[PDB]
Coordinates of C-alpha atoms in Angstrom, one line a residue:
Chain A
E1 CA 116.9 122.0 112.7
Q2 CA 114.0 120.6 110.3
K3 CA 114.1 116.8 109.7
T4 CA 111.9 114.9 107.7
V5 CA 111.8 110.6 106.6
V6 CA 111.1 108.6 103.7
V7 CA 108.7 105.4 104.5
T8 CA 108.3 102.0 102.3
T9 CA 104.9 100.6 101.9
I10 CA 103.0 98.3 99.6
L11 CA 100.0 98.0 97.6
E12 CA 98.5 94.9 99.6
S13 CA 94.5 95.4 99.0
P14 CA 93.7 94.9 102.7
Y15 CA 96.4 96.9 104.1
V16 CA 96.8 99.9 101.2
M17 CA 94.5 100.8 98.8
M18 CA 94.6 103.3 95.4
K19 CA 92.4 106.0 96.5
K20 CA 90.4 107.0 93.0
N21 CA 92.3 110.4 92.6
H22 CA 95.5 108.4 91.9
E23 CA 96.7 110.7 89.1
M24 CA 98.2 113.3 90.8
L25 CA 97.9 112.8 94.8
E26 CA 101.3 112.4 97.0
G27 CA 102.0 109.4 98.4
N28 CA 100.5 110.9 101.8
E29 CA 97.4 111.3 100.2
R30 CA 97.5 108.7 97.6
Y31 CA 96.7 105.6 99.9
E32 CA 94.4 104.5 102.2
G33 CA 94.3 101.1 104.4
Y34 CA 95.1 99.5 107.5
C35 CA 99.2 100.1 106.9
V36 CA 98.0 103.8 106.3
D37 CA 96.1 104.5 109.0
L38 CA 98.4 102.8 111.4
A39 CA 101.2 104.9 110.2
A40 CA 99.1 107.8 110.8
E41 CA 98.5 106.9 114.1
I42 CA 102.5 106.4 114.8
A43 CA 102.9 109.5 113.8
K44 CA 100.0 110.5 115.6
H45 CA 101.9 109.7 118.8
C46 CA 106.0 110.1 117.7
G47 CA 105.3 113.4 116.1
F48 CA 107.8 113.0 113.1
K49 CA 107.3 114.5 109.8
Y50 CA 107.6 111.8 106.8
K51 CA 106.4 111.0 103.2
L52 CA 104.9 107.3 102.4
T53 CA 106.4 105.8 99.4
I54 CA 105.9 102.3 97.8
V55 CA 108.5 99.9 97.5
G56 CA 110.5 100.7 94.7
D57 CA 110.8 97.0 93.6
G58 CA 107.3 97.1 94.1
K59 CA 107.8 93.5 95.5
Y60 CA 108.8 91.3 98.2
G61 CA 111.9 90.2 95.7
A62 CA 114.5 86.9 96.5
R63 CA 118.2 87.0 98.0
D64 CA 120.7 87.9 95.8
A65 CA 121.9 84.4 95.3
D66 CA 124.8 83.2 96.7
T67 CA 125.4 86.8 98.7
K68 CA 122.2 87.3 100.1
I69 CA 122.3 91.1 99.2
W70 CA 118.9 92.8 99.9
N71 CA 115.9 93.0 98.0
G72 CA 114.3 96.4 97.2
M73 CA 112.3 97.0 100.4
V74 CA 115.2 96.1 102.5
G75 CA 117.7 97.7 100.2
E76 CA 115.9 101.3 100.2
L77 CA 116.5 101.0 104.0
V78 CA 119.4 99.8 104.1
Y79 CA 120.5 102.1 101.6
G80 CA 119.1 105.1 102.7
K81 CA 116.1 105.7 100.2
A82 CA 113.9 105.0 103.4
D83 CA 114.6 104.9 106.9
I84 CA 111.4 103.0 108.3
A85 CA 109.1 99.8 107.4
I86 CA 105.7 100.0 107.7
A87 CA 104.2 96.9 105.7
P88 CA 103.1 93.4 106.2
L89 CA 106.3 91.6 106.5
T90 CA 107.8 88.2 108.1
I91 CA 109.9 88.3 111.6
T92 CA 112.6 86.2 111.1
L93 CA 116.0 85.8 112.7
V94 CA 117.8 85.6 109.3
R95 CA 116.5 89.0 109.1
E96 CA 116.5 90.8 112.4
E97 CA 120.3 90.2 112.1
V98 CA 120.4 92.7 109.8
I99 CA 118.0 95.0 111.0
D100 CA 116.0 96.1 114.0
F101 CA 112.1 95.0 113.8
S102 CA 109.6 96.4 116.5
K103 CA 107.4 94.3 118.5
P104 CA 104.9 92.3 116.3
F105 CA 101.7 94.0 115.7
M106 CA 99.5 90.9 114.7
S107 CA 99.9 87.2 114.8
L108 CA 99.0 85.0 111.9
Chain B
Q1 CA 85.1 87.7 101.0
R2 CA 86.3 89.7 97.8
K3 CA 83.3 88.0 95.4
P4 CA 83.0 85.9 93.5
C5 CA 82.9 83.6 96.8
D6 CA 84.8 80.5 94.9
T7 CA 87.9 80.1 97.2
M8 CA 87.8 78.2 100.6
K9 CA 90.3 77.1 103.4
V10 CA 90.8 73.9 104.5
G11 CA 92.9 72.7 107.2
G12 CA 93.7 74.3 110.8
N13 CA 96.5 77.0 109.5
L14 CA 100.1 75.8 109.1
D15 CA 101.8 78.0 111.8
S16 CA 102.2 81.0 114.1
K17 CA 104.5 84.5 113.0
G18 CA 104.6 88.2 113.7
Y19 CA 104.4 91.0 111.6
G20 CA 106.2 94.4 112.6
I21 CA 107.7 97.3 111.9
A22 CA 111.4 97.5 111.2
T23 CA 114.2 99.8 111.1
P24 CA 117.7 100.0 109.9
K25 CA 120.6 99.4 112.6
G26 CA 121.6 102.5 114.3
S27 CA 118.6 104.4 113.2
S28 CA 117.4 107.0 115.4
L29 CA 113.8 106.4 114.4
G30 CA 113.8 103.1 116.1
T31 CA 113.0 103.0 119.8
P32 CA 110.7 106.2 119.3
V33 CA 108.1 104.0 116.8
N34 CA 108.8 101.0 119.0
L35 CA 107.4 102.8 122.0
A36 CA 104.8 104.0 120.2
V37 CA 104.0 100.6 118.7
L38 CA 103.8 99.3 122.6
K39 CA 101.5 102.0 122.9
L40 CA 98.8 100.7 120.5
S41 CA 99.3 97.4 121.8
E42 CA 98.3 98.1 125.1
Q43 CA 95.5 100.6 124.1
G44 CA 94.6 97.9 121.6
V45 CA 93.7 100.7 118.7
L46 CA 94.3 98.1 116.5
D47 CA 91.1 96.3 116.9
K48 CA 89.6 99.3 115.5
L49 CA 91.4 99.0 112.0
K50 CA 90.9 95.6 112.2
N51 CA 87.3 96.2 112.2
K52 CA 87.5 98.8 109.5
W53 CA 89.5 96.9 106.7
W54 CA 88.3 93.4 107.2
Chain C
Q1 CA 96.7 60.1 121.5
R2 CA 96.7 58.6 124.6
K3 CA 95.4 55.1 125.3
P4 CA 91.7 56.1 126.3
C5 CA 91.5 57.7 122.8
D6 CA 87.9 58.9 123.6
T7 CA 88.3 62.6 123.1
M8 CA 89.5 64.8 120.3
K9 CA 90.4 68.5 119.3
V10 CA 88.2 70.4 117.5
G11 CA 88.7 73.5 115.2
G12 CA 91.6 75.4 114.8
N13 CA 94.0 77.3 117.2
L14 CA 92.2 80.1 118.9
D15 CA 95.6 82.4 118.8
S16 CA 98.9 82.5 119.3
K17 CA 101.5 82.7 122.5
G18 CA 104.7 80.8 123.5
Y19 CA 106.7 79.7 126.3
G20 CA 109.7 81.2 128.2
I21 CA 111.8 80.0 131.2
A22 CA 111.3 82.4 133.5
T23 CA 113.1 83.5 137.2
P24 CA 113.1 86.8 139.4
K25 CA 113.7 90.1 138.3
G26 CA 117.4 90.7 137.3
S27 CA 118.5 87.1 137.9
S28 CA 121.8 87.2 136.7
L29 CA 122.3 83.9 135.7
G30 CA 118.9 84.9 133.2
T31 CA 121.5 85.7 130.2
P32 CA 123.9 82.5 130.6
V33 CA 120.3 80.9 130.6
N34 CA 119.6 82.4 127.4
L35 CA 122.7 81.6 125.9
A36 CA 121.8 78.0 127.1
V37 CA 118.7 78.1 125.6
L38 CA 119.8 79.6 122.5
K39 CA 122.6 76.8 121.9
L40 CA 119.9 74.3 122.7
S41 CA 117.6 75.6 120.2
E42 CA 120.4 75.9 117.3
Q43 CA 121.7 72.2 118.5
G44 CA 118.0 71.3 117.5
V45 CA 117.5 69.3 121.2
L46 CA 114.5 70.9 121.4
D47 CA 113.5 68.9 118.4
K48 CA 114.9 66.0 120.1
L49 CA 113.1 65.9 123.5
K50 CA 109.8 66.1 121.9
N51 CA 110.4 63.6 119.4
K52 CA 111.2 61.3 122.5
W53 CA 108.4 62.1 124.4
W54 CA 105.4 62.8 122.2

């Protein structure tokens, strides 16, 4: 009956900031920031339960050579460590063909 | 804005691109968050966040 | 860049937007048109025409 999801985010200082009590908090409390309160607003509208996590590779990361096998942040979606990504990540067809994307939230 | 103010832009920037939320193919979560993003996009709440964080 | 050359841009772009070809609601040719657009994009003719005209 119940369901939960895992979220990917990144500690980019404009978008996510490490709260001073960083020793022992959970990712749903470890963090604040534009991505964090955007995610909170999205969950406020959509109602789903979630947990925030950093990208486990901790980086954008490159394509695997001659294979384009995905980096950590994309692989955590495609290989089920997470089910949604809410991060400063560039829209491109070379990614859209592999995974779906929302409407952009900013233009830059 | 993060002091020391010893860095600066020059030139009129290079391109225009979007940032958005993403979701793997077939995941049910996709459209019910996409509609929420549309809600925020039309309600303009993002302007509060931009003010708060820049 | 035209002959009079008596005016100039100032600053960068204020925002970002894009053009799209448009047709009335549900026009059945629109998807063939979308395919034509996609192919002309992939063929780079969007570069060709601008490089001709500008």
